[PDB]
Amino acid sequence: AGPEMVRGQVFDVGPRYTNLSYIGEGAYGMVCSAYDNVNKVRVAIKKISPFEHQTYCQRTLREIKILLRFRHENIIGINDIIRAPTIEQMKDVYIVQDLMETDLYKLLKTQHLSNDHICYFLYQILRGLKYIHSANVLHRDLKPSNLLLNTTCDLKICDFGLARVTRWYRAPEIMLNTKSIDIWSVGCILAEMLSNRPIFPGKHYLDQLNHILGILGSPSQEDLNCIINLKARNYLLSLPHKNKVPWNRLFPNADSKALDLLDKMLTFNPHKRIEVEQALAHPYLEQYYDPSDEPIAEAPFKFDMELDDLPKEKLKELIFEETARFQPGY
Numbered sequence: 001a002g003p004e005m006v007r008g009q010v011f012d013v014g015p016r017y018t019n020l021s022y023i024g025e026g027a028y029g030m031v032c033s034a035y036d037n038v039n040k041v042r043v044a045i046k047k048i049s050p051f052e053h054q055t056y057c058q059r060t061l062r063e064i065k066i067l068l069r070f071r072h073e074n075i076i077g078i079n080d081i082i083r084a085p086t087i088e089q090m091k092d093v094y095i096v097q098d099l100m101e102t103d104l105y106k107l108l109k110t111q112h113l114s115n116d117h118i119c120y121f122l123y124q125i126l127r128g129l130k131y132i133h134s135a136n137v138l139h140r141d142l143k144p145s146n147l148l149l150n151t152t153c154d155l156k157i158c159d160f161g162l163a164r165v166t167r168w169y170r171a172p173e174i175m176l177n178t179k180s181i182d183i184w185s186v187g188c189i190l191a192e193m194l195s196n197r198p199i200f201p202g203k204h205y206l207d208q209l210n211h212i213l214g215i216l217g218s219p220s221q222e223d224l225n226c227i228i229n230l231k232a233r234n235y236l237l238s239l240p241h242k243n244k245v246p247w248n249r250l251f252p253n254a255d256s257k258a259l260d261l262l263d264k265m266l267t268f269n270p271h272k273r274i275e276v277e278q279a280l281a282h283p284y285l286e287q288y289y290d291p292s293d294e295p296i297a298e299a300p301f302k303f304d305m306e307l308d309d310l311p312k313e314k315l316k317e318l319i320f321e322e323t324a325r326f327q328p329g330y
C-alpha cells in the first residue's frame with residue numbers, strides 16, 4: 001500500500017505503521033495516531049520537517065538527544081525513529097512515541113476537576129519536572145496541551161522541541177529580561193485547573209504584562225531591581241498603580257493550601273519563586289509526596305558541540321547520524 005495522507009501531510013511510515021489519524025501539530029509538523037503491527041498497539045507518530053531552518057534543526061537534534069537519554073514515568077519517550085535511507089532524500093523525520101488518550105487542554109475544556117484530581121495532576125507534573133530540572137534541562141513550553149493523560153489519570157510531559165540545558169504561560173522575566181520559568185508555567189496551569197480558564201490570557205506582549213499586573217499588583221522596586229529591557233521598564237513605570245488581588249478572591253472555592261502554593265509559584269521575582277523540590281514538599285501535595293519514589297537524573301545533561309554555531313547542513317548530518325541506530329541493518 002502507498003503512503004497515507006492526513007490533512008495534506010503525507011506520512012511515509014508503512015508498512016509497520018498504518019491506519020493513521022490526526023492527533024496534533026506544530027510549527028513544522030503534524031502528529032498522528034497509527035497502528036503498530038509489530039507490538040499490536042496504537043502509537044503516536046510525530047512528523048517533523050525542520051531542515052530548511054537552522055533553528056528547527058537545532059530543536060530537532062536537542063529533542064531527540066534529550067528524549068533518548070531521559071527515562072521517566074512522567075516524561076514522553078522515543079520508541080522508534082523513521083527517516084529516509086540517504087541524507088539527500090531525508091526531508092522529514094518521524095518520531096514514534098507511546099500513544100496517550102488525551103491532554104489536559106481537552107480535559108479542561110470539558111470536565112470540572114475535583115481537588116483530589118488537581119492535586120494528583122499537579123504532583124505528576126512536578127515529579128516529571130523534578131527529573132527534568134535535575135538533569136539541568138529546562139522544558140520552556142509547559143502548557144495544558146503538552147500535558148498528556150491516560151484513562152487511568154497517568155500524566156506525561158511531551159514536546160521537548162524547545163528544551164535547553166506560549167504567551168499565556170510565559171514568565172514575566174522572559175518578557176522583561178533559568179529553571180524558574182518552568183515553575184511559573186506550572187503555576188499558570190494550576191490556576192487553570194482551579195477555574196477551567198487561563199489565568200493570564202493576554203492578546204499580545206503588553207497585554208500579557210497587564211494581565212499579570214492586574215492580579216499580582218504593581219511590581220516593587222526590588223522586583224524591578226534587576227537587569228531589564230529599557231522599553232519594558234519605561235512602560236511599567238508609565239502605568240498607574242495596580243492593587244494586588246488576593247488569591248482566595250479569584251478562586252473562592254479553592255483549597256487554601258493549593259492557593260498558598262500557587263502564590264509561591266506565581267511570584268513575580270524569579271529569585272523568590274519556589275523551586276521544584278520545595279513545591280513537591282508543600283503541604284498541598286502531602287498525600288502524594290514520596291521522595292523515595294521520585295527519580296532524578298544520574299548526571300546533568302550537556303551537549304558536546306554547541307549547535308547554535310553550526311550551519312543547518314551540518315545539523316542535518318548530526319540528525320542523520322543520531323537516527324541511524326533505528327535503521328534496519330544497523
Ligand SMILES: O=C1c2cc(-c3ccnc(NC4CCOCC4)n3)cn2CCN1[C@H](CO)c1cccc(Cl)c1
Pocket residue numbers: 023024025026027028029030031044046047048097098099100101102103106145146148158159160161
Ligand atoms: O509533540 C507534540 C505532541 C505529541 C503529542 C502526543 C503524543 C502521544 N500521544 C498523544 N495523544 C493525543 C491523543 C488526542 O488528544 C491529545 C493527546 N499525543 C501531542 N503533541 C502536541 C503537539 N506536539 C508538538 C507541538 O507542541 C509538535 C507536534 C508536531 C510537530 C512539531 Cl514541530 C511540534
